[model samples]
Target: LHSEIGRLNNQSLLWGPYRPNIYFGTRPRIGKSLMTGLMWGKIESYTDFQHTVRYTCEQNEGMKGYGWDEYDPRRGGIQSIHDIQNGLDITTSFVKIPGGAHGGSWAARIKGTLNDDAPKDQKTIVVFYVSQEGENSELEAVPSENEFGYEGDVILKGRSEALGNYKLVVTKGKGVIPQSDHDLSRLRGPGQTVVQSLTYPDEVLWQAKPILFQQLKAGIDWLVENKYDVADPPPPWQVYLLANKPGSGNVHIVQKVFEGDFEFDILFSSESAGKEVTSKDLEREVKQATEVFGERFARVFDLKAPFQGDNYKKFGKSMFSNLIGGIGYFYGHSLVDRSYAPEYDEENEGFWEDAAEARARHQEALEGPYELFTSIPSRPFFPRGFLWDEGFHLLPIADWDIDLALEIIKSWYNLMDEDGWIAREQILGAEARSKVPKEFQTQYPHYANPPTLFLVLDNFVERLRKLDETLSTASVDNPEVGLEYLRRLYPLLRRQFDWFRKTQAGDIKSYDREAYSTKEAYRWRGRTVSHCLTSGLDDYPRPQPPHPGELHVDLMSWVGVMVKSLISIGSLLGATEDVEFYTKVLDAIEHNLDDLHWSEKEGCYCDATIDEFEEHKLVCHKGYISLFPFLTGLLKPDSPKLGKLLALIGDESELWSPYGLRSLSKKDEFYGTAENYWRSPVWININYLAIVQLYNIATQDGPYKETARDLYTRLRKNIVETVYRNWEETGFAWEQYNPETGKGQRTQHFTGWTSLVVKIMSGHH
Candidate 1:
């Protein structure tokens, strides 16, 4: 029988059609009510004038046409269906249907029978069937009263009219039910079949209505919780300890912190219970701890009032917060005011005191000229100690407490691992236990920090000599301390040197000859296919190609550090063999600089050839790296090419920037924007090396001293301005500061490099 219908909604949709089979699954909250409402709306708007519509819900049954079959016969059946039929009558239980469940499994099965019966007729009987679980019902066949002894036909249909009630019946003329009748629930006999089927119209629609409300609410909640548009987390109060009064000029004070309860676990721990400790509570603990520590140490030295009062409290709280926030700040100070030197006791005249006192007195006298800013705390952390910053910090610390300076040196020495390496990062005691990762058993030991140890040694040696006439000092020492230091440090420094050497050696030949080859071989290719194809025409390319010989300057500068460290350590240990080896290494490094890196035509050392066949030309972008050779004493000022090299620094367009120096000249196409990765910016390390080299050359006097003095003066000014501006805007000494704006950028708020500010203020004697 055919039935006509119209209109539907959430309520009618649930009550009408296949409501008997639509049992709510596990997710009853929104899945049931929401899906029912959505389907109801679809039926009301999309059903046709025939009043006939069909939809299917997948049930975990063996209905092949309804998409409920667990297997695909082509490959293998899905597990659920295959297991059920492993030993049973598989053929009768599993039936195949084309287009499966979406096209209506019951309708297709019924239609197959009708098509077989009325082979010649286009118009045929159609059937619909529904399957219900539970008790089996007796089946009866009613014969159709047709001609040719066909005995007409019988149609068996079943449906659930109510929740628990189900009925199965056969309709037609006359037929007898066999003794062995089929029961669907029991699967007792041959399956019943349908006689006729007809095609029906179909429609498609989007499933969007019900879930829109919830999705919008969730998105709003996420935005508010993160505070994305608001202020960044505040800098701790200890940053103010590094600030100075307006008229104090520039002073270098080596800042130190003793005991404080700064725990990293409170913020970084992934557990909710650990995070519950309030920020205020942590601040209170740090203040109390630092106060007790300061009070205990008060009798040792007469500390300034601000340091004893406000500064101590402020730094303590900030230190705690900074640790909890997962950033570290510590500085090594080497120079200080002359008046701050500890009074010498005649009873303490020993080898240690003689050397220490001499170094301290010399630094005090030498650093006397410049008005120093002693208020700021110096950070003793490594790598974070930007370029010249550690040198500056040492100048003041060395002047005030030479023994403490030596102890700091000894501390680094003591911490070296069996492999002769020092950790790039360090945390101590309870803080270390809580914050250090399992992999970092002894501070993160792989990476190297800036080489300030050599600079400290240089000052220590010079000052010790000036202190006493009777002190018989030799560069070499017993007990292997000096030898061990060199042995441990050289291999590590050599590795950094090798990083550039290998890259340069591999890329050199092709990079050099690129200009001589045909097809414009010297030009580097861009990252994108379109850019690569149009490389000749485009001035700038995304994912820019590596510049040939780009790493040369950094390598040369690192070699300078290695050479200095090796020479000092070797001489001190009296290891003639080691000294000769380092001297040879230094000569080789200097030779490489002059021969391979220098270019007279370019007026300065430019990029070198990387690949000969590719004819890749190295791009010559002027920056601090090119000048590093000269700054490191590898290149003499009186050399033929010295003027041209010096011209590079004088040219404002090339290396100079308000922030110090840029990595690439602004004139180069590849010069990065302020925030761009690998952009031109003066790094603190470069400045430190240049200053130290200048100091070394200045000792010779006359023209060298004049040139060195000019550079040192300009760099010191830049350091002061950059530090002050960065501190003003970001309230921290940072990894880097923007050249254009002089604002801190890409900085860890409690950065180790920023401590350079305090170090620089404490000028070296």
Candidate 2:
């Protein structure tokens, strides 16, 4: 059985070869056949049909093939014999019957002839299967698996079992045929005949067949599932040494183990009378032991000699001699050099005396190292003497050596720029030619480095006063030496303060205000408009675009730092007018900051105006920049708003990350990926500012101190760990690390901010 068809290759069934002829005439004419023949000729030429014909209803008999004499005159001179004829006549009459009581009961008798005297006995049948044309059909008929052996052809036929019944069927050959109970129905008229056409059920072909050769090009190939081949590098032995004791002899040993070549050797000596083993013989034995321990002797020397410099040189010369001397000293002190030990046999008496003397000598030496280093004119910029890095380097120096710290501070002041500004970076002499930027003559001039100067000066002054009680007494005779030191430092301190204020203000103006101004202001003509701030204007060049709101808050907080510095400098210098001027400046700055920038609704300070479509509007960034004011103590530490700000900081999706605090949170629309140059995770300067400010705030009475402390401690730890881990991974320090993975991200292999890692790690904090 064939099913009714609808579509093939997504096309309609009617889209095929059949072309119907239009017959237009009041009466049958001889030319009708000629016209039909011509139409058939045209269709056959264009189509693949092999046969064509026309039949007349009047002369054709029920069984006769195309001939006029086959028609009989008795029944209107045409074939009119068949049981199906009764069914056709009844069905046709039933459709025309009107709705009434008699319509259900009535039966009509048929007359042999009509008043027009036209033949009504003729029959015509058109037998042809519809042929699909154009593109070939994508479907084919399938025979039943159990019954039919091969595929079947789909066809449509009339079924006379039920009146007006028609159905599509499938056959092995000869197309579809009527059932035995059904007979073909024909309608006869005066020189006219009509036959109904049936359509094949080609759509059933798809359902019958197994779907094979599916469109294979539409999907992804199956990925192979296999074990990943990962080869981890050998667990570095250096790690064990570092973990056991950082910067110890074990580290050196591991370094040697990793770098040195190894060999085995034996030495035998004989003399006339039991030769006494000399110190040289011991040295040879120790060197032999070093080689036997799989130590990379040559590589160890190379790595350590360059790294440790004079220390390595001293050690190399006295390697055996020091061993001998130390052994002798230990022996002599334990046995022969115990002459006066028992003079005062009191408990721990000798121990106290010896410790006190040693401590005094150590203090004396510590007091003078900075002077000695500074006094040597030929002392190098780095490694041997006070240099640009000495500013930071002297912080830890002050903790242990106050007098030396003072000398280093003086050295930095001596090299101050003409404008009283210290360059952010520095390099010394012609030897620095290839090592650093050429523009860094004595030190870099354009940008200012971290403002640790104020802290350093404060520490220096505090330590000096602690060393001398007369400074605290405030007597006329001794006058505070610490106060005098401050007086000398006042002008330099003021100059540096002014530099920070003016530079910070300029950065804010250029980054926050000027960059976002209309294109017309800058005379720039470009298709794609940008609101992003460029690195800098002509004088100051930066490596990246200005972060949103970073300059504004940084400037605000820096102004506070400057104001405090100014007040201290003014008070110490005994400049009443200067003090009054700074006090008023501080008040005005604070007032302006509160009045113009703070947003009560947003609970943060926002930019006064942001450029948008050539117009300015108030806009706020939810980044860490907004929290600076609060962090810097510009906001009340105990206020409810501060709690809100802390809550904002606590969000993992916002600021906190494994690498440190992200500059922008991942949830923020502007949060950049780790490697993005413009905006991403934490920066050293920002983290330094945040940690310092947060610590300051935490020291005050605040409930969030524990949280803030936790953040700061974690941040510090991350910084330290990242530095060490990056060094381990790349054999070099890096500029930035991925906040998510704590992996090294951006690194300048030769030179860049990574150099700061060494200075940072040198106990400079």
Candidate 3:
């Protein structure tokens, strides 16, 4: 199950794994042109010979410069890579080609030990990478001389003119020394006599040979082969699968098909552990089984399907595949000794402390970053989970892979503390910690993240309704899994809701300090001068210098959504009283949302703040914040508010823009002032929510349907274009965009939520 060989300097690295670990490097040929093919290998089995390879070059003028991936024949691959990279060691005239060092990276994203005894076919140490050199620098690796152990022989039989069958065979050792850590030592049992063979398409040979086979002076067994490792990749290994989506397209699994081969490389390795024993001989069926593994994944998450006819459909599937590939782990942790103390600035702190007292609420946080096996927001940038972000992420995933979706949901809910607190941003584990700044690492107990989890659960019910008829479906298949899952999820979700209700309750104290309530409303707590960023919209302006006893439309709207989800889920689960319990709360919330937070004068939902007289006043930003009711589906098609809501969305001078709905109204005074964030920008996730709501109302054919389609059509086109154009220009998805300029802004490669653009364009909401 393991492979290793130790060198003198504690620098040796072994390749054991199930899937793959690769070695690739090249030397400059002559005429400033000759190049070798990028080499690759796999350690899928021990009965099968571990192998290494380099393609034979076609245009070699002469033996020019020399380089090796796992070179030196004595040193292992890791050290060999670091060997010359130790430094350039200057002085004499040196050729400074366009390439030097573009960047650097960790070869392995995860470092957990591999299983020592699992079957070879379970899964391999999956590893795949895009050509790091970008468009300008093509990757190349050259083959080296024999230094492989145990005296192995290789066979390269021509399967045909365009292709050949390459295999490496090695026998048990008789003379070679087995340094304690060497793979030869670990692979010293039945596999030694297995006489296994590896099969590779000669046009492209992928094998796992010894760490530095070229370094060996002699071995009891010598590895042999047809000796020709020459190839010119027809398709770039890991470039674009679909080419027109700007920088945000799918990647090719094995790129050089026309050159006479196709490949299924390693998937993103996010699991706990794996085992591999492919260093010896094995039954031929073993190889066929391995072939099936690759074929199945390629078909399920196929690249060819995306690029063939409906390119959008192809990319949509490709993205989900890629996203699943990026699955990762972050071990959740707790601050060993911290209480539920947030940066307190609550204007009505006294009223809230009393509510906290009455409930005897308890919450806790650790002193440092925690860990959880959570999906990262972005593999390249922020490879860590965010409490709120995971909910948004799992929405589409739920449809494609329901079991996985439910697993993630369970993980998120499980992280809840006794008082129902889950940190909004999860900077768990050392790797997750490395990307975040020092200030943002710790979890804040009182800061509530949007309960986007409800949306995920909501979608889950809809999915179940489609698949089975047992739970509120027009035609039930009777899985009844929806109700069953909800039953199991009820207690935990209910606790989390209780925590949110109490901790984020509105008017902890309102006008007349005694007018405290957790009954009818709630407000975001721990506010700063301009706005309370706990909602995840950090810079959206609010009433400056913050106010007390204030309730926000977005926060209230979000609560409504959460309550509705529970009401439905509880109803099916037979939690009758809880359903009725939430229904009353929903009624109160809607009534109050209409009274306390709506602005009849401005024709929209707005947050309410207080003036010096302690009188309620409208704090309207007239932006996406105002559309929360619609975003949450609280605004029905027949509702009176729908008319004004449509007007606001359609207005050229306010929320509407060529890119999509601006986060802030263009006519607002705060628009374009400072940072320009949350102020006047378009975000795909928001536009996506808007589209979903529009579709929700349009389900029945009526005036609502007509109006809803108009809005849906406009939003979808603009939102899709905003993402498409930016990707085209920058070759990346963005965090946000300038509503006025039709230009993308903020973080690039932000394929997290912005990836929702696919759902919008791919004929799915």
TM-score of 2: 0.40
**lDDT per residue as tens, model 1, 35-151:** 111111001111120121121222222222211111111111111111111111111111111121111111101101111222222111111221222133221222334321122
**lDDT (Cα atoms) of all candidates against the true structure:** 0.33, 0.32, 0.48
Q: Candidate 2: minimum summed lDDT over ten consecutive residues — where?
A: 326-335
TM-score of each: 0.40, 0.40, 0.61
For model 2, how does the per-residue alpha-carbon lDDT over 336-445 read when each residue is reduced to its tens digit?
11122331121221233543343334221101111112211011111122232334434433432344345446556755655665433333222222223432233223
The C-alpha stretches of model 1 lying farther than 4 A from their native spots are 1-452, 464-551, 607-609, 612-617, 674-678, 695-699, 702-707, 725-731, 748-751
Q: Residue 156: error of model 1 in Å?
A: 87
Q: Is candidate 2 or candidate 3 better by TM-score?
A: 3
Candidate 2: where are CA atoms >4 Å away? Answer: 1-397, 400-406, 436-450, 461-479, 499-551, 599-624, 630-634, 639-641, 673-678, 709-734, 748-765
Residue 74: error of model 2 in Å? 99
For model 3, how does the per-residue alpha-carbon lDDT over 126-217 read when each residue is reduced to its tens digit? 11222111122222211113222112321111111111111111112122211223233332211111111222222112222221121121
List the candidates ranked by lDDT, beginning with the highest.
Answer: 3, 1, 2
Give the Cα-based TM-score of candidate 3 against the true structure.
0.61
